[PDB]
């Protein structure tokens, strides 16, 4: 297909990174269609180790043009640092990076109300670099925001602003007893640099439609997991925003008809940041050894990360919300040096009833107890192996399973963080 | 195409009405997927005009089942209000209709804050018709809401009523300088149709997934025009919802690739309401011939509906946004006496460009001028015809015209009320 979505069917740390930079190789246009500056893609260049949270890693490519679709919430600020960052190193961002007009931004008085919203009416928070999102994204939905068009009409921005600012001022001191923002510092950071985002402009929906009848490869790229969907996720431990692939469209421009192929990024076991259901959770020593062996201490860290069997109740739950087409299995050595492995297939709920589909969010979920199937391990190695034939006979029914189960293919094993250390059954270009 | 989405492609009033109670026919399940109670059916109960805003039409049907996905925000005394209704004249409303768990939820402070906000502008309201419609979704994004989900825990509902509601009150009465919504009142009224509504709820996803893998027809139901998207239609002179065909995947749980055909409820002329850019609306007595011809008044306040010849530009546009399969064409004959008649095919800007493709920017609407295709009209006439025979090879060509200029096949053509006056030259389910 040439149009590729990729994205995570859990809760995050499926690993995406390798994958996605992977697919860019081919990928003509690489796109972000929802969330903001929380991406969190690693990357190594000129013996530096950089982190982008905006910018689509797809920069790196020559041949490749990286776009901020209006699904996008953006922060002139967050951008402009990594703009920074790479252009330092070498690298020509202001050419190859385009975005939509109709991107919401990201200002102070919007992290303030965050703060606020949160330290406030709460009483301990990090966050990390989420910061703002939620409300740049209630602006846009009572219509008081200000995307990035705005910015031709400097002056009419500078009105437009000086409206949305009085409201949130009156809110943060009035209600949270918190700072004002002081509306010119904004009015000046902002103006400092509009000519710059006003240059990488462009009409988004039209180019995709462009590109989808010249035959281009595009690959649309998610940055968080399939069960932090605002609507459909867990609620109400949720993220930010909408994560399914049914925000493409919308994010986009482009019709949801164009879709081709949806990459479902799969963990070979669960995992979870933070509170929030996880019917699956090991409290003996399966856990322990699985985040010891996984590393899971670290990579766009958190606090707190459980470990699991995989899921195929929640799995095939994320099937269905994002339509997927094939499956990348990732870091199934992890799983190795055990005896025996299992994976979910039914849940019994606080009542006697065994359900296959994940019940409803407000049924009970700490109530759930899981069902598992069983199968016994591998004793040999993985880590690295770059074929069917030289992989455990065991290991090998543990994927067919997964198959089975969901009723989805796997299509790419990635065995390793190198390249190679990869096994393309499918190729989701070419199918 | 065994799921079928139905939506107007313009700026509202394309006339979905009829099209809809007539494929509801075939349909085995009906679905609403955004928007509140605003939707606007007019329909006949036994020789009795009846509205009904929130409950999509098909309830009248006996084979159908008529769901309301997640997307619609739902507020608890209208679909009240809608049921004793209903069934007040036999129709069994409590068993042919079902709801979603995730749908916000509209409830009196909602109301009660849109109200003030159209108090705060009077002149220059914005014109309203649902009330709350928005503040649920702002309340929605910003995590601070309440979904239909949260009435199963009696205990916990009223807690965050109790903390969103003096978020609420702090701002009806400190900003606004408008009475605060009474807290117990909306619990107490909440309450009583609790019992109700937890009824109703049920697992759209798997249930509309299951009717897909089943073969079943699916109809999902647009209630606004897709040039009022809140992401790609005119800001900020769009409505709170997506309303294109990406929002289906959203506002059900259903992925995208399992959109099989999309049809645009298409007028022969274009309106709009209220204020915002219009490049063929007319200023002459052509113009007013269409406002009585095809009775473009106001239903709810009298006003008058801005009229103009066909934009191509617009419509293409539409296209583009819902990767569109067929047109219905609706209200022909309305042109049926005129000596010519016109097809803007394209627009003009100031420095002399014309371009084939909408603006983006809310000023660039501002310069544009239509560059007509002007051709011979028809006297005879057009309403009620049934056969493609008896049609003046003017109608002919103009509708010719349309489809060379778009793309998009005109697959229906609705001739009038009766379920009779209507040329299916595909059949949206077969095709």
Redesign the interface.
């Known amino acids: 297909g040439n149009n590729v979505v990729v994205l995570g069917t859990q809760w995050g740390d499926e690993g995406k990174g390798k994958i996605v930079d992977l697919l860019t190789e081919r990928a003509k246009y690489v796109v972000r269609y929802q969330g903001g500056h929380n991406a969190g893609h690693t990357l190594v260049i000129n013996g530096e180790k950089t982190v982008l949270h905006l910018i689509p890693s797809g920069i790196l490519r020559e041949n490749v043009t990286s776009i901020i679709g ?2 996008v919430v953006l922060s002139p600020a967050a951008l402009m640092k990594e703009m920074k960052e790479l252009e330092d190193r070498g690298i020509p961002v202001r050419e190859r990076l385009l975005l939509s ?2 991107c919401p931004l990201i200002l102070d008085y919007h992290v303030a109300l965050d703060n606020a919203r949160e330290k406030a009416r709460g009483a301990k928070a990090i966050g990390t670099t989420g910061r703002g999102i ?2 740049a ?2 602006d ?4 008081r925001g200000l ?1 990035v ?1 705005d910015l ?2 400097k002056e ?1 921005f500078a009105e437009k602003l000086k409206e949305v600012m009085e ?1 949130h001022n ?2 943060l001191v ?2 949270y007893k918190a700072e004002a923002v002081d509306y010119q510092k904004v009015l000046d950071d902002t103006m400092a640099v509009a000519d710059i985002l006003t240059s990488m402009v462009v ?1 988004v ?2 180019l995709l ?1 462009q590109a989808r009848q010249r035959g281009d490869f595009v690959m649309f790229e998610g940055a968080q997991g399939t069960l932090l969907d ?3 996720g867990t ?2 431990y ?1 993220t ?3 994560t ?8 986009s ?7 081709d192929y ?1 990459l479902g990024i799969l963990k070979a076991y669960s995992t979870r940041v933070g509170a929030g259901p996880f019917p699956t959770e090991l409290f003996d020593e399966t856990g322990e050894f699985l985040c010891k062996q996984g590393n899971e201490f670290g990579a766009t860290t958190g606090r707190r990360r459980r470990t699991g069997w995989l899921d195929t109740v929640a799995v095939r ?1 994320a099937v ?6 094939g499956f990348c299995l990732t870091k199934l050595d992890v799983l190795d040096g055990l005896k025996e492995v299992k994976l979910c297939v039914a849940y019994r709920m606080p009542d006697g009833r065994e359900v296959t ?1 994940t ?5 009970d979920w700490k109530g759930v107890e899981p069902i598992y199937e069983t199968m016994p391990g591998w004793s040999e190695s993985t880590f690295g192996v770059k074929d069917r034939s030289g992989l455990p006979q065991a290991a090998l029914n543990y994927i067919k399973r997964i198959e089975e189960l969901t009723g989805v293919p796997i299509d790419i094993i990635s065995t390793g963080p190198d390249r190679t250390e990869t096994m393309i059954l499918r190729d989701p270009f070419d199918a």
């Open positions: 209006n699904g007009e109709a939620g409300p994204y209630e846009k939905v009572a219509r995307r068009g031709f009409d009419t409201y009156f809110q009035n209600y009409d929906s039209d439609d605002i609507d459909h609620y109400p949720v930010s925003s909408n399914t692939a049914g925000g493409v469209a919308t994010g421009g482009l019709g949801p008809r164009y879709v949806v739950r269905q919300l994002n339509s997927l087409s589909t019940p409803l969010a407000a049924d």
